[PDB]
Design a protein around this ligand. Structure first.
Ligand SMILES: Nc1ncnc2c1ncn2[C@@H]1O[C@H](COP(=O)(O)OP(=O)(O)O)[C@@H](O)[C@H]1O
Ligand SMILES: Nc1ncnc2c1ncn2[C@@H]1O[C@H](COP(=O)(O)OP(=O)(O)O)[C@@H](O)[C@H]1O
Ligand SMILES: [Mg+2]
Ligand SMILES: [Mg+2]
Lengths: 342, 337
């Protein structure tokens, strides 16, 4: 008879699962966001732009130059939402926690931080000890959720791997034992991908994972020091694969989260950056063929840009005049996107 | 030990509830549908119209009068869905069943069948012993759901009341004791309404209620028999009130289902017209809704409110001679969304 609790507990969750993917689907599946960051004490003598916020999801930006102002015309863009200099980390996390539950439910996620250097990706994805980013929160939420699922029969296992992509070249950031990795078809799924030779530790709790994350950062030997042309010009893919198994019932749940702290989008490899973009738009257009294998980064995420996959995308921008010319570019991508979702 | 687990059930269900309403919301909350009925053996020599189906949620009608249709511009309308002559009762019910869940979760529902006489309203809401309508299936679905809910701690209680509105006059279809009934502010909710003197039976199962529905139908002894300007000119409000109580937790769930079998739409109309206004008035987020301008809009005031969910069926006849009317029916729909 208590089977009727556990069995119906198995059933309410099954229904909860569909309502949620349905909500997810109507809401989007490929949402684009914008994040604007407050200027720093070391930029108090820096020139801004004029941020006009027409409604909670649209924003127009204008060059404080009254002269150039004439030939530029208009600069107005909308998104599924917009975050302004007073928007907290916890704010941005609201837009993400749902996708986290989708992964536990068996769907692949992809959160990308994108923008020109200085914009705020690293701050967004990782954050800082004072105000943690998406990844740190994602982990806590992940372990909380997992904890509960036990009472339902599901035993979850997390499998983390951390790497970097610098010039169409992959780097395990968990080992210094310099090897040669390759993106290849997963043995039990020609559609899933697998990286050969990566360190794939199985997280034991927020701790063990915070560590691993630290390690990955160090081994990144982040020479943001001298000629940093490296870190600001390379992709950082953190992947957590969630494997849920229900014995005495069978069937498993497999969903993966891919937290990409993208390279800076500025100008004078871009092989990926550009390629990544094409792929994204190519989907929105239900295009027949997506060039996933045209770049190490799209090949690697191929299985999470798929059909049921859900993608977040943050465009970070600096509220500064000198940036402006870039700041606009970052947004245009956002504008070119939603023009396809039409 | 169950006290750590079953609580997760009340806790789980709770979240299902929150999500369903979220889906309901994005979907609509106020959806307008369209049903076209196929011609009968007694209409084989009747003139149809040109039913163009541009996509599964849009359709264009046209006067076979190459003469008239060349003088009108067009005849095109889209709904949240459209059902054609081949659409079954079970099809329509799929559009409804979700709202039945909302009811049990504590929201107010309203299903309206609407159109010119002879279009399909009575068929849709009540149906026939062969192909039952929305109301019959709502009761079955309502009792199944209830039956499972027990295991979650909730005890549900249904409370039916059937009435008719003829000329801004309310008739209790469950008693022949001819009394005077009034619409007034509920005691424990000034926004809620309560009719005085209505028989309010507490349904015990599909039977008890099917019975009551029959009674209600007999006690309707309309003039459709001898002077149809009656039945086909009055409103039939069936109302099931769902009250769920969770003891050893407190908290109750109060929701109602209002099944309205509207009166013919051809140009009394005090209500039918008013009803229309009110509907549209909501889609426009208007400041003040004139709920008390008609007997129907005042009875349903609480089930058209904020959270409230509303389904609107516009039945139409596939006939040339109905044409001019069939377009008016669709214009209302053209303005809703
Ligand atoms: N939202 C913010 N609030 C406060 N400081 C921020 C914010 N966003 C970015 N910063 C600051 O600037 C730095 C973050 O780097 P970032 O702009 O993420 O990299 P890139 O755009 O080169 O990938 C941090 O040292 C942090 O103090
Ligand atoms: N979908 C249908 N399939 C078969 N018969 C139908 C259908 N719709 C309506 N009818 C028929 O016509 C009658 C229904 O009346 P109705 O058109 O609902 O009323 P009004 O439009 O006057 O409110 C029934 O006797 C039924 O046989
Ligand atoms: Mg950075
Ligand atoms: Mg009728």
């Amino acid at each position: 008879e208590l089977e009727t609790c556990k069995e119906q507990l198995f059933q309410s969750n099954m229904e909860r699962k569909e309502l949620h993917n349905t909500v997810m689907d109507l809401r989007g599946n490929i949402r684009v966001f914008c994040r604007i960051r407050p200027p720093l004490e070391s930029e108090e003598n820096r020139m801004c732009c004029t941020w006009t916020y027409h409604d909670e999801s649209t924003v127009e930006l204008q060059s404080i130059d009254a002269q150039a102002k004439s030939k530029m015309g208009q600069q107005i863009f909308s998104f599924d939402q917009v975050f302004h200099p007073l928007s907290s980390q916890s704010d941005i996390f609201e837009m993400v926690s749902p996708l986290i539950q989708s992964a536990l439910d068996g769907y692949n996620i992809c959160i990308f931080a994108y923008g020109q250097t200085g914009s705020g990706k690293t701050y967004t994805m990782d954050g800082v000890p004072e105000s943690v980013g998406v990844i740190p929160r994602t982990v806590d939420l992940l372990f909380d959720s997992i904890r509960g699922y036990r009472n339902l029969g599901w035993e979850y296992e997390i499998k983390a791997t951390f790497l970097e992509i610098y010039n169409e070249v992959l780097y395990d950031l968990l080992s210094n034992e310099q090897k040669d990795m390759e993106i290849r078809m997963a043995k039990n799924n020609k559609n899933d991908i697998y990286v050969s030779n990566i360190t794939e530790e199985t997280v034991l709790d927020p701790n063990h994972l915070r560590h691993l994350m630290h390690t990955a950062k160090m081994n990144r030997a982040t020479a943001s020091t001298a000629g940093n042309e490296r870190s600001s010009r390379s992709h950082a893919v953190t992947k957590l694969e969630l494997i849920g198994r229900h014995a005495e019932k069978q069937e498993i749940s497999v969903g993966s989260i891919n937290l990409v702290d993208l390279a800076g989008s500025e100008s004078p490899i871009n092989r990926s950056l550009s390629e990544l973009t094409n792929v994204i738009l190519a989907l929105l257009q239900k295009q027949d063929h997506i060039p996933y294998r045209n770049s190490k980064l799209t090949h690697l995420l191929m299985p999470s840009l798929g059909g049921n996959s859900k993608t977040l995308m943050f465009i970070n921008v600096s509220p500064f005049q000198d940036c402006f010319q870039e700041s606009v570019k970052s947004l245009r991508f956002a504008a070119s996107v939603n023009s396809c979702k039409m």
